[PDB]
Design a protein around this ligand. Structure first.
Ligand code: CLR
Ligand code: CLR
Ligand code: VSN
Ligand code: A1APV
Lengths: 228, 286, 55, 335
């Protein structure tokens, strides 16, 4: 009983469904990654290091590695309330959280009083312990290697944390920063912080993020198959 | 004497509890949860094979009880065909579910596109087609014969009967006892080694507990498979090799072997769906 | 700079007219009762003229 | 300094509103006939979204609507035959607003890219393509409504609304005045005012003609997520995260009615009115929408059947449809 116009409408809707299914099949294979941190710490630098070797609003960068397609979601241009748009990133594969090692004694640009490292710690607290990122593992990229080396060879770390008792060597200080920046999360069974110090080692960064993505993909497939 | 009554009780309880569990699995996989994942389709097909296999049990039970088959040639023809059919379909759906889990764990980048509901559907289609391609010879070659004042309808063969029956028995044995066991063992072993070595499942007490639970469910699956399949296949192959004299002990041995081979299909819904974590999550929703 | 702007803007906002809330609520009530026969969701219609026929 | 006189001017405004408020809405509607037990069922269901739908908008022909989701697809729904008219690939995967022209010739969408994209629906070549890229904000575009075929008013993440000349691609007036991040706006039927609610728990009326604020309504608590004008253009309702909706008057300036239940705690994402205005449908966050009698504050009915968060709502112009979008990728046309 369908006329020519209704037949054309049905055929057009079928073609739209076909192209939509192809697009959804393409977009159910891509890997989503989300950059955060302080306004100076590490995110634009790591995406700049990323784009230099493979080739306002949200800055995007797409690349391929080992036949896996990744995505870059740099939200540094969103000078607004983080609460009202943080729920838009549920289906991200992993979070690349960039902080600065050498920001423990640097004074924040506003009010000349608040610490940079403790502010990054508060941001990591709010991101680890919110209702939107529970099944998403958080990679952490403690950047600013050489600046941290020089500033701990010059100044003690106890100016930032008034509980430090170890020596002013790199290994113990970086271990202290890492463990204090790890244990703050309130749920350690599901969340799995894969930490990796870096300054400019591009080959190790992509392999580390691919290992973390492979682990969370394995966890997702284990959820899919009902084993876990 | 009374051995036939115990065989009747065993067959009846196995058939009843198998149909009971399969009906619950069908109901919960249709109405409560949906079948939009690959594993749901695989469990549904396994439940289909298990329900269709165990429905022919009272036919064989009354065949042994009355000592004759009063149900006609076409009925036991389709019963024998659907028995071979369901046994291969259950075997291949267990094997392909196992290789799907191995692909999911050990090959995750490839499983991003190899693990889709459409691919699960076409694998199930190829499963039932490749089972039909070997159940079709059982269709026409099954017939009803008369012997010793009684009616039985074991399938015959061609004029050179000896190598034909030998070839069919060894083909069934090699396929449904070397294809399932070897593939499922190597695939679940590689999966459990790579699942031991992963960062998510090592370094804590709860990670080791999840590791232990996954290895335990894999071991229970392979153990009930081996326990249900080995005593009947080698009993068939030794009845084909040597002539076992007619004794009540060997008859109740044969009936126990058949009962175990059907307890396999009884327990696959329990150890594949009731123990599945997504199904348990759906169970806790109500 | 924003403090004097908000002060002047809200001083301009303050000296406006305010009709009695009984009158405004009565006007809202009148608009609701005068369009009761026109609203399809308040008063359902039979499926003859309904453009949403289930099938 | 001037903070004390600003505070006493605040107090003078509240005293004037208290003196001008002589009878609440529920006192005069005590003898009105309630809508009673209402029942509504899902006539149509628009399946075809593969991701998280955030906003939609109807059309003035009451037939064609437009929806947007996280996948980056702008699907035009024919709510009569449950068809797909167009599929526009958005350049930004993140959108939480879209608008549909009364003329139908243009469609709009915007999100975390801070830019409103305009697409042409009646192009002579027969396809859909970009026509103007309205950029100039510094926050996420959280709401957009076509004033007419050549103007759009948008609420943004930079606490300022903005009228836009769609042709030249530049603003003509900026509605600064929010001390908080504005999410939603709604247009008057006569198309001369629009009220926008922000995260500072205040909705403000604005004169579209010149770009000045006229009132501010500070009854809510947490933050405003939704807003919708009354059909007569002399009232509006506000959705918010404090488990309460509020009806206001542009003239009396007080809070007329409160729409809250002690058994519900979740927030409100979308609000829209019917033709008569007796019916306000607030999309809650308890996986369903709620039917509110807009004169008795009585929950007449429930619109259940959504598997995820209710994201958007809209009643068509002739009032025969309640189109509810949701995070569970399923639109449901109700009647
Ligand atoms: C009944 C026997 C003897 C004949 C052979 C029938 C075969 C072709 C049938 C029987 C069971 C069927 C499957 C049962 C369940 C599903 C899930 C559904 O969502 C897609 C089709 C799929 C995967 C079917 C594919 C075709 C199938 C395998
Ligand atoms: C591998 C594990 C599960 C053990 C399997 C045991 C099976 C293969 C055993 C259990 C009972 C056995 C039968 C018991 C009795 C007899 C009678 C005897 O005159 C010939 C052997 C025969 C016919 C046996 C054949 C093999 C048999 C069926
Ligand atoms: N010596 C040294 N310098 C580094 C390193 N990483 C980044 N920088 C610089 O530190 C500034 C901070 O600005 P940055 O772009 O990160 O802000 P943002 O991304 O939050 S927007 C940038 O100009 C970087 O050159 C490092 O390892 N070693
Ligand atoms: C428990 C039922 C499974 N059956 C499949 C068909 C058959 C069978 C089994 C195992 C191996 C075979 O070669 C074989 O053929 C058949 C046979 O010769 C008698 C026993 C069986 O009915 C039984 C198990």
């Amino acid at each position: 009983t369908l006329s020519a116009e209704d037949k054309a409408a049905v055929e057009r809707s079928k073609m739209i469904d076909r192209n939509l299914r192809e697009d959804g099949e393409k977009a159910a294979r891509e890997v989503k990654l989300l950059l955060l941190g302080a306004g100076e710490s590490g995110k634009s630098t790591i995406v700049k290091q990323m784009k230099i070797i493979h080739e306002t609003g949200i800055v995007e960068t797409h690349f391929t590695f080992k036949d896996l397609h990744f995505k870059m979601f740099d939200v540094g241009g969103q000078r607004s309330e983080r609460k009202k748009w943080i729920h838009c990133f549920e289906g991200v594969t992993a979070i690349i959280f960039c902080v600065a090692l050498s920001d423990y004694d640097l004074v924040l640009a506003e009010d000349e009083e608040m610490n940079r490292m403790h502010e990054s710690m508060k941001l990591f607290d709010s991101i680890c312990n919110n209702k939107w990122f529970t099944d998403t593992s958080i990679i952490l990229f403690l950047n600013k290697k050489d600046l941290f080396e020089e500033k701990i060879k010059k100044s003690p770390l106890t100016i930032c944390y008034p509980e430090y008792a170890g020596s002013n060597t790199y290994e113990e200080a970086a271990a202290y920063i890492q463990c204090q920046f790890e244990d703050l999360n309130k749920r350690k069974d599901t969340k799995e912080i894969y930490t990796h110090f870096t300054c400019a080692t591009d080959t190790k960064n992509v392999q580390f993020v691919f290992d973390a993505v492979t682990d969370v993909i394995i966890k997702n497939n284990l959820k899919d198959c009902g084993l876990f | 004497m009374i051995t036939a009554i115990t065989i009747m009780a065993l067959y009846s309880i196995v058939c009843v509890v198998g149909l009971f569990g399969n009906f619950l699995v069908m109901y919960v996989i249709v109405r409560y949860t949906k079948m939009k994942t690959a594993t749901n389709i695989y469990i549904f097909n396994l439940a289909l094979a298990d329900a269709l296999a165990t429905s022919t049990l009272p036919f064989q039970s009354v065949n042994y009880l009355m000592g004759t088959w009063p149900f006609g040639t076409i009925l036991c023809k389709i019963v024998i065909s659907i028995d071979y059919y369901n046994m291969f379909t259950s075997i291949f759906t267990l094997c392909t579910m196992s290789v799907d889990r191995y692909i999911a764990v050990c090959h995750p980048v490839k499983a991003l596109d190899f693990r889709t509901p459409r691919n699960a559907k076409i694998i199930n289609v190829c499963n039932w087609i490749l089972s039909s391609a070997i159940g079709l010879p059982v269709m026409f070659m099954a017939t009803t014969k008369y012997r010793q004042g009684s009616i039985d309808c074991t399938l015959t063969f061609s004029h050179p009967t000896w190598y034909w029956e030998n070839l069919l028995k060894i083909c069934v044995f090699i396929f449904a006892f070397i294809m399932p066991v070897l593939i499922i063992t190597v695939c679940y072993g590689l999966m459990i080694l790579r699942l031991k070595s992963v960062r998510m499942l090592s370094g804590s007490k709860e990670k080791d507990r999840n590791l232990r639970r996954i290895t335990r469910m894999v071991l229970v699956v392979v153990a009930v498979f081996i326990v249900c399949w080995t005593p009947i296949h080698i009993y068939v192959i030794i009845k084909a090799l040597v002539t076992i004299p007619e004794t009540t002990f060997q008859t109740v041995s044969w009936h126990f072997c058949i009962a175990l081979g059907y307890t396999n299909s009884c327990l696959n819904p329990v150890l594949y769906a009731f123990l599945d974590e997504n199904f348990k999550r759906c169970f806790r929703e109500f | 700079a924003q403090a004097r702007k908000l002060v002047e803007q809200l001083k301009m906002e303050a000296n406006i007219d305010r009709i009695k809330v009984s009158k405004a609520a009565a006007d809202l009530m009148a608009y609701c009762e005068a369009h009761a026969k026109e609203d399809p969701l308040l008063t359902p219609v039979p499926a003859s003229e309904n453009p949403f026929r289930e099938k | 300094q001037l903070r004390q006189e600003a505070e006493q001017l605040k107090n003078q405004i509240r005293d004037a509103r208290k003196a001008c408020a002589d009878a609440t809405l529920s006192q005069i509607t005590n003898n009105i006939d309630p809508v009673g037990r209402i029942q509504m069922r899902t006539r149509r269901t628009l399946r075809g979204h593969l991701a998280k739908i955030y906003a939609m908008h109807w059309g003035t022909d009451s037939r064609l609507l437009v929806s947007a989701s996280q996948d980056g697809k702008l699907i035009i729904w024919d709510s009569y035959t449950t068809n797909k008219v167009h599929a526009i690939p958005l350049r930004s995967s993140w959108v939480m607003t879209c608008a549909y022209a009364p003329s139908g010739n243009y469609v709009a969408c915007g999100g975390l890219d801070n830019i409103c994209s305009i697409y042409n629906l009646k192009t002579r070549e027969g396809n859909v393509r970009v026509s103007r890229e309205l950029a100039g904000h510094t926050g996420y575009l959280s709401c957009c409504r076509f004033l007419d075929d050549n103007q759009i008013v948008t609420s943004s993440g930079d606490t300022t609304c903005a009228l836009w000349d769609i042709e030249t691609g530049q603003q003509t007036t900026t509605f600064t005045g929010h001390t908080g991040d504005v999410m939603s706006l709604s247009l008057a039927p006569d198309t001369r005012l629009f009220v926008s609610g922000a995260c500072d728990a205040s909705a403000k009326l604005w004169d579209v003609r010149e770009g000045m604020c006229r009132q501010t309504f500070t009854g809510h608590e947490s933050d405003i997520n939704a807003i919708c004008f009354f059909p007569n253009g002399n009232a509006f309702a506000t959705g918010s995260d404090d488990a309460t909706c509020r009806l206001f008057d542009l003239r009396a300036d007080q809070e007329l009615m409160t729409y809250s239940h002690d058994n519900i705690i979740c927030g409100i994402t979308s609000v829209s009115f019917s033709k008569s205005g007796r019916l306000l449908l607030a999309g809650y966050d308890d996986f369903n929408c709620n039917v509110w009698d807009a004169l008795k504050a009585d929950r007449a009915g429930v619109l259940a059947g959504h598997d995820n968060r209710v994201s958007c709502l809209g009643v068509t112009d002739d009032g025969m449809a309640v189109a509810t979008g949701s995070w569970d990728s399923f639109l449901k046309i109700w009647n």
